[PDB]
Design a protein around this ligand. Structure first.
Ligand SMILES: CN1CCC/C=C\CCCC(=O)Cc2c(Cl)c(O)cc(O)c2C1=O
Ligand SMILES: CN1CCC/C=C\CCCC(=O)Cc2c(Cl)c(O)cc(O)c2C1=O
Lengths: 214, 214
């Protein structure tokens, strides 16, 4: 119920401000970045399960699932990967200095394509190209379900999850899309972006479509 | 977190035992019954909003939404209707003697078609034709989100909801389908049942389909 507030490491806030304000054209690369991250999480739970089979029992199916929520202007990207504990959301998503953050900003100033973000290990922050707010909902086998939330400012919140659907195991990236980026709520657009940049994915990519009967 | 246990009124337990054990053929009528109930809830919030417009602001869209969850063997029927308080789930779904329950059982003994269940005002209990367990998740503007749960036995539970997605307003009927009734997880089957028995519905009926990309 009670939210804990944490400060972002200085260089991460600069990077987030850069990306949320950019007039850069090829904004669709955010999906490639989030599918790769999702695929890495799925590799980690699969690799871990080789010597610990019981790790998969909290969520036996290994998948990536994309759910547009047009009514809320939300796009969700779920995976049944390793997930993150409260301590892993705090360290990995904001407080610890990520190797590559300042160097990616340096490559960007020199002329690099924002598309290179994933080679610097900070591809997660590409979501701010299309979203002005994000909730990272995660369930690790080692902890309770938690919500990490950011709006590209200097601080983020972490809250024990008592409001969202139960994840058996994994992470949900809940993107609150910008008014000009509502095209990523469309099935044809989503399918087009997936086929173009995520051809070699070892896990099924599912698209959740809502349709009116007759 | 803590579940409260309540006893069913004697005649409701008889009716539920009757329906969960029946070898009756036309089991698909359960959907017609749940769509009518959903449509009545939607009428009640719409009628109430005529003199109280602010009632619709917790969930402005009026819809019926069917979500098969094949992995869990679950079928969900959501509406953004009036919803029920903790006291309304306890009174309306089990403790208060429903007018028509014993008379429907009397009509059934005499030879009536189970399809008549809705004319006796107890159509909700037709869900036990296809499910051996049910969770009624409901959010009224007047109360918190609660979970009513039954497996056709003599008692039901009511629990404050800290585990499911937030309903803005309305009810979710979460059916845990029987091993022989997993056909109602299929889009073609669901669409066929809706077109045959629910032609005159004033609200959009949405079907949530999950599909693997490429
Ligand atoms: C991949 N992991 C585990 C964390 C692995 C360790 C360090 C990297 C931290 C950043 C992430 O990659 C977190 C994450 C994101 Cl952003 C995602 O979009 C989907 C996921 O499923 C995860 C995740 O739960
Ligand atoms: C219609 N109401 C309000 C309760 C109205 C008063 C008395 C009747 C009680 C039984 C119901 O009909 C409850 C209900 C069911 Cl079972 C349903 O499948 C969908 C709904 O949305 C509701 C609901 O929330």
């Amino acid at each position: 119920m009670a939210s804990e507030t944490f400060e972002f490491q200085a260089e991460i806030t600069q990077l987030m401000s850069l990306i949320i304000n950019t007039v850069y054209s090829n904004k669709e690369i955010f999906l490639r970045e989030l599918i790769s991250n999702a695929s890495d999480a799925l590799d980690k739970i699969r690799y871990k399960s080789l010597s610990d089979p019981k790790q998969l029992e909290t969520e036996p199916d290994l998948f990536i699932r994309i759910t547009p929520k047009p009514e809320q202007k939300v796009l969700e990207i779920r995976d049944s990967g390793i997930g993150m504990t409260k301590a892993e959301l705090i360290n990995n998503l904001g407080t610890i200095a990520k190797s590559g953050t300042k160097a990616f900003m340096e490559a960007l100033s020199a002329g690099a394509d924002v598309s290179m973000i994933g080679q610097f290990g900070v591809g997660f922050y590409s979501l701010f190209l299309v979203a002005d707010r994000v909730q990272v909902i995660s369930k690790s086998n080692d902890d309770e379900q938690y919500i990490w939330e950011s709006n590209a400012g200097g601080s983020f919140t972490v809250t024990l999850d008592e409001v969202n659907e139960r994840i058996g195991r994994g992470t949900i990236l809940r993107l609150f899309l910008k008014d000009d980026q509502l095209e990523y709520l469309e099935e044809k657009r989503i399918k087009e972006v997936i086929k173009r940049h995520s051809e070699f994915v070892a896990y099924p990519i599912q698209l959740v479509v809502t349709k009116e009967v007759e």
